Amino acid sequence: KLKAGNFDVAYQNPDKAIKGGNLKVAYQSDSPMKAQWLSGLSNDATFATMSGPGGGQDGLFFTDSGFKFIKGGAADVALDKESKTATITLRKDLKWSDGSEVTAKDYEFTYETIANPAYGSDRWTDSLANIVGLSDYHTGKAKTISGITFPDGENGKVIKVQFKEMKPGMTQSGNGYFLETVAPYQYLKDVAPKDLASSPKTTTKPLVTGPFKPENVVAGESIKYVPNPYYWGEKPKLNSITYEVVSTAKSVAALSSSKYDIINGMVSSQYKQVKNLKGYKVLGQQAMYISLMYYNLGHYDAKNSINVQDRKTPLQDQNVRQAIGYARNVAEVDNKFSNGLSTPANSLIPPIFKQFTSSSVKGYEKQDLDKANKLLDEDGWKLNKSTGYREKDGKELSLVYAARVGDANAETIAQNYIQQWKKIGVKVSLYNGKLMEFNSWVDHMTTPPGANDWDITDGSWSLASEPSQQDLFSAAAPYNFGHFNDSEITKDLNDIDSAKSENPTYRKAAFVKYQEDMNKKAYVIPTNFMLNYTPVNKRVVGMTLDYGAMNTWSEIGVSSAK
């Protein structure tokens, strides 16, 4: 039995909030905090969530519960279909945490932090290539970005972004075709590009635009938020916010002792205990998330920003990729460890984007050992009676599985799949004989070209707030860390964001073909959709998980002290 999305979205406290005082928040991370206040240089969702009170790495635009752009935030955006342009207008009194003005150059500088390879960003994508002159700037063929212009100059509050083709998702946040953050140029201009990621000016002592500012950052541990006097909007209620990382093992004990008022991104296996904790209300909603299984299919060319599917591996055969997916027992694993929060995935598009999901799409949600064996049989891999593993040309079907650290069931689940691949005759061993730590895993997947010492890994995503998956799978993007390149898949991705897909009936059919083709080609295998839950202490006022709530950090407060 799986739990329905009938969790309470908001905790409506009858108690009035005080002045201030001190809120204590934590994020469940077994890895140390990675402090990076520039959106272009940060790859993890862990710190992106922790940077919330500071502006969410300096987010600009406001949003309704459907992630669509609305007016009234730090900046406003307007589209023009026939000219193929976006116009971004910053607020006249938009300021950094040091009092200095946020200008048009600050927004453009964000594009440079990703496009200019000297900063070492992993966020380059085919989506960004749609901006006129950005590809030429990215390759170094130009000195500036021609598609980005300033109607009122670099000091002004207006920026114009020129596109080659208009995209449907442009009315929605997380589209990726244009950026939504600003970076402090004046403060960071004297720092060499290759030094910017490790500079104290982007890590421990930065400048922000949000309601709170980091008074102190304890590297790899915590943030000390205090109210920002130069914030354009409402004055926050609280005196301070402390945002800390908390290990999986210590999370439940931290709740019992009231050390934290809120813990975000808790694993499904702990919900059993969290629900029994009085003094806390457990909120919840459909996670904008997917976990899936990756195959290592090639390498990434960094100089030319292109994924090359050229790795010499038995995983280049389609029948081998499908069988390994069909061998897994995701459903059995879910029913045993996830407390009804994880539903086995049928495709790549999560239930949260309900409009573009289809029950017609059959995937790998149901285990089929017989079909797995057959697919391997009719492909040329014959089982060896002696060893118990399939062989071809005398080469044994031996693969490396880079499994990852997680909850207390992480090591169990990893071995669970290994035994299933054992049943079909595929020899699978763990990477270096032990589970991989999150921080070093990300570096191993994102850094070019790169790694050839793994075959199977598990990817977990805090997905973009827009259904399109160009920033995950497009040929130019490093985030495609399996490094596949398929003409049909590219066409499917492009057709999803084509001019015809402005028509939602057409875009619906483009998503359905994409999901069916991704399942068939089996470059990646959809594992889980998740339902997220959040324990909130009963003293907290104005707390909500609603995606439409914009002034959340300013309106949030407490009813009592410790």
Partner: peptide, 9 residues
């Protein structure tokens, strides 16, 4: 807003 690597939850 943008895609991000998550720990596994």
């Amino acid at each position: 807003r943008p895609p991000g690597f998550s720990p596994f939850a």
